[PDB]
Structures are given as C-alpha cells and as structure tokens.
C-alpha cells in the first residue's frame, strides 16, 4: 500500500486489516530500520499530513527508540547510535524542527526529541539539543505550540534520562522551565507543560535549592502557580510542593508559615478531589520526614554528635488545624465502594493513622471530641467517621491511655456491630480488629468478652467486607487469649483459656465460612483459613476434642479437592485450586502439631495417601511439591519412628526434591526433611544413607545449585552422624575434608549478602563437626574409641573458630555453635584441648562474648564450655 495510508489502517472497519501495518511496518523495520525511521521523520516534520499519519509516524519512531523494560530499553538506544553515525545526522534536526508545527499533534515530536537524546547524551553527543530547547523559551518571540511542546520534550527528558548524566547543565533547563511558569505566560497549557517538567527535574536541581538565592525564586513561582485558576496547573503545582517537601525539608523553615501552610490547608479543603488529595499528601510527607528525623535525633544523641538535620515539628504543630479537616473528610464517604479507587475519604483515614504514629499521645485529645460527638449521629456517614477516627488513632498513643477509652467504647462498639449501614459495619469490624491486635488486654477483658464473641461469631456470616475483618479479629484474639491464660498454663500448655467455652462453635463457624459461594471476595477464604489455623495453633489443651473433629473435616476436604482437580477451565480456576490446595496442607500442618501421637497414627495412612498422591500425580507443577514436603516433615516429627512404613513408599519423591535444584526452595525442604528423618528413625535410616550421602555430596559439588542450599547440607551431615553413630565412620573421611574446605572459604566482606552467606556457612560447618564428634562419642560415658579418628582435626578446628573470633562480622549464632563445639571437644579429647585454646586467647574473649551475650543458646553454651575448660585446668 503506502505510508500515509498503512499507519492509518488502524482506524478502519476490519479486524484482519488492523495489522495492515503491524506486519508491513515491522517486517520492514529490521530490514532497513535506518531506512524506516528516517523516512518517518519526513512525514512527522510534514505540516501537510494529518494527525493520524504524523502521530502514527512518531509512534513507530518512538517505540523503535523506547520501551518500558530496564533491559529492552537500554538495547534500542545502542541500535540508535550503532546506526550510520550519519543516518541520525539529519533526524536530529528533522524532528527538532517539527516542534510547534500543528495544534496538539506534533506533540509526538516531544516523545522523540526525548528518547533519542536519552541515548545520545550518555556519550557526549548532540551538543546541539539542550542549547536549542532552552532558547526555545528564553526567546521572547516563540509560540504556544512551540514552547508548550518544547517544554514537554525537556520534561520527557528529565523523566527517563539517567539523572546522573544531566546533573550538569541544569540552570539553562531550570531557567527554561522557570520562565515557562512566570505568571506572565498567557497560555495555561504552557505553564502546565512546564510545571509537570519541573516536577520531573526537582531530582537534579539539588545544586540550585542549596543556594537560598535561586531557591526563593523557585519557591515563589511554585507557590504562585498554585493560585492559577487552571486546576490542571493548580494540581501539578501542589505536586511540586509535595515532592520538594520530601527532598528539601531542611530549607522549608522559611516558606512554611507565610505560605505552604496556608496553601495546603485550603487544598485539603478543596471540593476538588485531585486537589485535596495533594493537600493530604503534603502533610503525610511532613509526617514521614519528621518520623525519620526523629530516629536521627535518637541515634545522634547517643553518638554525642549533632543531628545531621533537625525537625521543626510541623506535623505536631498543625494538629489542631489538621484533625478537624481530616475527620470531616472521612465524612465524604462513597456508599458505592467495592473500588480499587483512591479518594479524599481514604487518603484522610490513612493520613490520620500516620499522624497518630508520629505525634502519638498528643493525637487523642484532638481526635476524641469528634469521636464522642458523632458516634451517636443519625447520619451514617458521621457514625462511620467516628468509628473510623477512633480505630485509626489506636496505634501511636501510649496503650495505658487507650485501654480505658477502649473499655468504655466496647458496648457501643458491640452494638454498632449491628448498625444498619454496611459501611458502618465494615468500619467497625475493622476497628474491632485493630483493638484486638493493638490492645489484646482490653479486648479479651472479661466484662465484655462474652458479648464480644457472640457478636463476632455472628459477624462471620456478614458480607465478605465485614466478615473478612471479623476473621482477622479472631486470629488476633486467639493469640491473645492463649498468651493470657499463660499463667493458667502448666507443664508447657494452658489447661484452658477464655475462648474455650466457645471454641467448638468458633472453629465450627469458621469451617462454614471457609466455605463461601463468594469466599474469593475480600479474601474471605484465605482469611478464614489463616484464622482457623491460628485458632488451632493458639489453643488450650482442653479443647483438643474440638481440634480432632476438624482434622477429619480437613482431610475430607483435602480429598474432595484432589479429585476436584480434573474440572479446571479458566487459567483462573488453576491458581484458585492451587491456593485452596496449599491452604489445606497449611491447615494440615497446624492441626497435626496439635494432635496426640495416638491420633496421628490413625490419621497417618489417609494423610500420607493424600500427600503421596498429591506429590505423585501433581508431578507437573513444582510449587505443590514444596508444600507436600512441608506436610510430611510435620508428620515425620509427630510420628517419629512409626513413620518408617511410609519410607519405602516415599523415597522416590525425597529423591526428586533433593536432585531438583532448579527450584532450590524445594531442594531446601528436601534437605531439611532428611535431617527430619535422621531424628525420627535413626540408625534405621542406614538403608538409604548410601543413596542420600552421595546424592547430597553431589550437590555440594555441582555448582549450578543455589548457595543457600549448600549450608543446609553440611549441617545435615551432622544430623546423619548423630542418627547412625558408629556407622558414619564409612563417610567420616570425605565429609571431614569437605568441612575443612568450606571452613577456610573466604569472601569479600563488602557484599553483605556475602556476610550472611559466610556466617551461614561457618554456622553450618560447626554444626556438622559437632554432630560428628557427638555421633562417634556415642553416649554411655565411656567415650567410644571412634572419636579418636577426629583427633587429628582437633588442631585445625580449634583454628577456624579463631578466624571468627577475630572477624567481627559475626553473629551470636556462630559464637553459640562455636562455644558448644568446644565444650564437646573437651568432653572427648579434652587435654589436647585446654592448651590449644590457651595458645589462643581470642577464643577466650569470644567465650566471654558468648556470655555478655543476650541470646540464650549463646549464653548457656559459653558457660558450659568455660566450666568444661576450667575443669581440665586442675586435672594435672
């Protein structure tokens, strides 16, 4: 066809003709892109053509010079100057002149003057661009279409051009952008393209704001600009105050009182959403900057140094002005709100919560009156705002100040649970949750606990909106009820707690809720499960019979779902299934850990069937795997030795997981299960040891495997030695050499990740050594001759620990294992020990460190190690 016809073959009656271009154009670009875009630059700089051929022209010039993928992007640019260094020669003035050609269609020229330069500037090139654009505004004789679209270009440059490579020439650009804003400028359309430009430049004007001279002018323009009756400008202007406030809080002391304060407050009031959202945003940004400065103050104080910057406490200062405006905005509700839609009402409740965590205590007084007055108001929008205001100041204030208010708010809270308005009811279930999570104490209080639970058991039937928070409520409440009956807990677990009387009914209803023709709305389902799991984990040993009925119910559903797999239609249906799937296993783990060894056995066959079946058949997913392994581990841990019968009928899978290092997550689970098997079976595991040891030692060698997986392995070698004892001698040889290899490993302690990794390695090795000495020492206080095999290494070992003892990048965890390893070493050889550590003071300082340490494991082990060493002192 043509060029001015194919690009327009997108706005025509024909579905197969829609690509009349996407094919010709594309299947012609690669051939001669330098002869596909260049030509396009001709139609673009062509005043004759329309606005669907020139624009569609620029689009193919833009896209062939840009994309929004951090990789695909930095790839087209090269191609742009990998081309004839002469082919662009004309384009960079063929397009640089299209600016100011039509009404609102050569605007694409901006989209191009940008991307191009966004590739020709990082190489010191096109020194004829920035000079142009600027002059295109400083020149008191340019047109709107001219300036307007020139500003955009500049704008589109600051947005995508590496700030780094532009930090230079910033006064010309800033000057251009500043003039495009002067109140003089007739066209608002211009000011606008200039304000949106400044916003994108605020980042690399750091140099400018520093000199108070320029600043005041920049600050004055932006403030005026907020007065321009063109809302579009108004906003973009308020947008600049918001960013500036978050980049130069230090230089705001000046224009705050005589300007910003007034400008923004009005803004918060504006009946224009786009406007007030920026007002609220401005102060949320104050809160952020101030909370962060508050840390600085705390840190600097115990650093005997002044704070790099200090807070003028604006937020605390405008509380009296802010709170009334916010609590009133919470009133501009939107009954119609199942929306992923942001708006003043939302922004305000959040901003309130922010202020609450910033000014803490001070907040209540300003908020309480609004709460007390409107929690009774006939207008549901005001009752709502009251409940909402109340729930959202619950985090920040000192709890012992809120606890009382809460206690007196509970009856009202409980009744409001039955308010006629859903909105009121959503907001209340939420507030109830916040109470439950931030102030358990008051929630679980016995004066209203009875009515409070009746109400929630009911709330569970409500709309996904209400019920969902009701679930959250029950989880918070559950953990709180447990941790409370704590002193009523003897022999490691509460005989009973306050939810007992209703437990049976709570889990019962939660199961029903689990079930919801709409369970997918508001995550009602995931929340119900997470909630049921939590109600189970944190439960009293007196409602065990209630946990049983559940297990059956969970196994029942795990089955129905496993057969329910052959009905998947929409890609949606898949993910759903997978979710319900995992959620159930997750529930299986939590229930199992709570059942008696006895109940475990009965459930055993069934569960393992489902899990074995679920791993087996579902041998075409990958994510499912890592979930069934978890389930088994849990089962292995409760069954202990009786798990031996499922071993054969399970081995293949543990194998798939241990070898499958393409998804280390699963390999990790597999590695853990091994150790989980070492303790449950022991010696008995010997059958597979052969296979496992090699298969594992294989991964330590093959280096495709993620390094996180490695330390887990070395660690497991010690779990194995402990379970097979004297039999480990078969493998003692290589393992010992491997541990040494890993022990002497090294990394640039300048790449953190590499600190964690190194310590995980160091901590993993020490564990394996420990498990080995222990495994060979056996246990019948006779010290089996086997331990002498590691007698040679004793010299080396007491070494590696030293390196550590020296290196500061440590971890109490490492110090813990190390202390222990020593203890054992004294316990096995013990002469040969006392002097080597004597010839190594650092070790001793480490031991003390393992005492002046807060961590438990660290403490005890150091203690012991020290007594075990001091014992060897008077043995001579």
């Amino acid at each position: 066809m043509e060029l001015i016809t194919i690009l327009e073959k997108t706005v025509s009656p024909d579905r197969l003709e829609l690509e009349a271009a996407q094919k010709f154009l594309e299947r012609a670009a690669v051939e001669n892109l330098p002869t596909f875009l260049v030509e396009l630059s001709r139609v673009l700089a062509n005043p004759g053509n329309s606005q669907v051929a020139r624009v569609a022209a620029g689009l193919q010039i833009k896209n062939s010079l840009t994309s929004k993928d951090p990789d695909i992007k930095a790839q087209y640019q090269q191609r742009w100057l990998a081309i004839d260094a002469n082919a662009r020669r004309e384009v960079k003035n063929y397009v640089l002149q299209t600016l100011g050609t039509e009404t609102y269609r050569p605007s694409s020229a901006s989209q191009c003057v940008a991307g191009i330069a966004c590739a020709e500037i990082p190489v010191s090139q096109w020194p004829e661009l920035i000079p142009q654009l600027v002059a295109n505004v400083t020149n008191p004789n340019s047109t709107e279409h001219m300036k307007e679209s020139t500003l955009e270009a500049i704008g589109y440059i600051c947005q995508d051009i590496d700030p780094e490579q532009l930090q230079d020439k910033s006064n010309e650009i800033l000057t251009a952008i500043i003039q495009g804003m002067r109140k003089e400028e007739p066209s608002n359309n211009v000011k606008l393209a200039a304000t949106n430009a400044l916003l994108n430049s605020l980042e690399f004007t750091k140099a400018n704001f520093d000199k108070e001279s320029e600043r005041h002018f920049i600050m004055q323009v932006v403030c005026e600009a907020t007065q321009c009756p063109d809302t579009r400008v108004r906003v973009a202007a308020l947008q600049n105050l918001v960013k500036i406030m978050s980049l130069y809080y230090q230089y705001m002391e000046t224009y705050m009182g005589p300007a910003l304060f007034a400008i923004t407050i009005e803004a918060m009031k504006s009946d224009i959403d786009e406007v007030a959202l920026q007002g609220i945003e401005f102060w949320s940004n104050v809160c952020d900057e101030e909370m962060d400065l508050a840390i600085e103050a705390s840190e600097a104080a115990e650093q005997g140094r002044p704070p790099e910057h200090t807070s003028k406490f604006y937020a605390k200062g405008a509380l009296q002005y802010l709170v009334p405006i916010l609590t009133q905005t919470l009133t501009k509700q939107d009954e119609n709100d199942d929306d992923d839609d942001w708006n003043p009402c939302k922004a305000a409740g959040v901003c309130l919560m922010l202020l609450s965590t910033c000014c803490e205590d001070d907040i209540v007084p300003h908020v309480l009156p609004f709460i007390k007055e409107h929690i009774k108001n006939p207008d549901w929008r005001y009752r709502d705002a009251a409940v909402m205001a109340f729930g959202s100041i619950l985090e920040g204030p000192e709890p012992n100040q809120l606890k009382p208010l809460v206690i007196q708010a509970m009856p009202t809270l409980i009744e409001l649970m039955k308010d006629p308005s859903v909105v009121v009811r959503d907001t209340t279930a939420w507030t109830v949750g916040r109470i439950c999570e931030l102030l358990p104490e008051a929630a679980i209080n016995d004066v209203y606990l009875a009515p409070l639970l009746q109400c929630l058991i009911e709330g569970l039937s409500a709309e996904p909106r209400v019920a969902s928070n009701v679930c959250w409520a029950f989880s918070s409440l559950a953990e709180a009820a447990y941790e409370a009956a704590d002193v009523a807990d003897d022999q490691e677990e509460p005989a009973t707690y306050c939810l007992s009387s209703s437990f049976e009914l709570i889990v019962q209803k939660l199961l029903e809720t689990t079930d919801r023709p709409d369970g997918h709305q508001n995550n009602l389902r995931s929340s119900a499960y997470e909630s049921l799991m939590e109600i189970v984990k944190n439960s009293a040993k007196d409602c065990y019979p209630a946990v049983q009925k559940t297990t059956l119910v969970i196994m029942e559903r795990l089955q129905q779902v496993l057969q329910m797999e052959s009905h998947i239609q929409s890609t949606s249906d898949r993910i759903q299934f997978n979710d319900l799937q995992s959620l159930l296993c997750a529930t299986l783990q939590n229930v199992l850990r709570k059942v008696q060894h006895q109940d475990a056995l009965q459930i055993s066959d069934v569960v393992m069937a489902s899990l074995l079946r679920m791993f087996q058949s579902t041998a075409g997913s990958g994510g499912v795997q890592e979930d069934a392994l978890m389930a088994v581990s849990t089962l292995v841990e409760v069954l202990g030795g009786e798990f031996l019968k499922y071993m054969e009928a399970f081995k293949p899978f543990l194998g798939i997981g241990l070898k499958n290092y393409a998804e280390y997550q699963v390999c990790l689970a597999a590695v853990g299960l091994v150790g989980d098997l070492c303790r449950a079976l022991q010696s008995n595991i010997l059958p597979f040891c052969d296979e496992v040891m090699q298969l594992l030692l294989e991964n330590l060698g093959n280096e495709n495997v993620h390094r996180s997986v490695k330390p887990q392995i070395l660690s497991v070698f010690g779990d194995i030695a402990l379970a097979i004892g004297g039999e480990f001698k078969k493998y003692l040889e290589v393992v010992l050499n491997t541990l040494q290899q890993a022990s002497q490993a090294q990394v640039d302690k300048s790449d953190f990740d590499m600190v964690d990794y190194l310590n995980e390695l160091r901590e993993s090795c020490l564990e394996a050594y420990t498990g080995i000495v222990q495994g060979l020492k056996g246990d019948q206080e006779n010290v089996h001759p086997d331990v002498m095999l590691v007698q040679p290494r004793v010299e080396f070992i007491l070494s590696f620990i030293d390196h550590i003892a020296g290196d500061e990048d440590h971890t109490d965890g490492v110090v813990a294992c190390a202390a222990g390893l020593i203890g054992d070493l004294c316990t096995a050889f013990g002469k040969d020990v006392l002097k080597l550590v004597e010839a190594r003071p650092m070790i001793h300082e480490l031991l003390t460190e393992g005492r002046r340490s807060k961590t438990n494991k660290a403490k005890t082990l150091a203690t012991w190690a020290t007594k075990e060493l001091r014992k060897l002192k008077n043995q001579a």
């Binding site: 909370m291 962060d292 840390i295 600085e296 999570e437 931030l438």
Partner: protein, 61 residues
C-alpha cells in the same frame, strides 16, 4: 520452641530496646523504617569517606 519466628522480641529489642512494649506489625514497621535509615546514613557516610580520601588524603611531595 515457643519463639523462633514469633520471637520478634529480638528484632524489637534492637529497634526499641527491651525496656518498653509494642505489638508485631508495629515493630516490623519500626524495623523497616530503621533499616532504610541505616541504609541512607551508611550511603551518606560512605560518599563522605570517599571525599576525605580522594581529596586532601594525598599529594604533598
């Protein structure tokens, strides 16, 4: 046993000290803000040592 993942008391200890109290979410919030702060500080402190080094730290025959 009882505190290994629920033992945010340790993470709390750092960010707020053992002394006072607070709930989960209001500790990983304090944790997140604090890390971000230590990151910046560290960056700033870093681009500083880089100046006192590259600069006057050398050249006086």
């Amino acid at each position: 046993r009882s505190s290994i993942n629920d033992k945010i008391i340790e993470l709390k200890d750092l960010v707020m000290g053992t002394d006072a109290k607070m709930h989960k979410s209001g500790v990983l919030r304090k944790a997140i803000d604090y890390i971000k702060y230590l990151q910046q500080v560290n960056h700033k402190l870093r681009q500083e040592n880089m100046v006192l080094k590259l600069a006057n730290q050398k050249n006086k025959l």
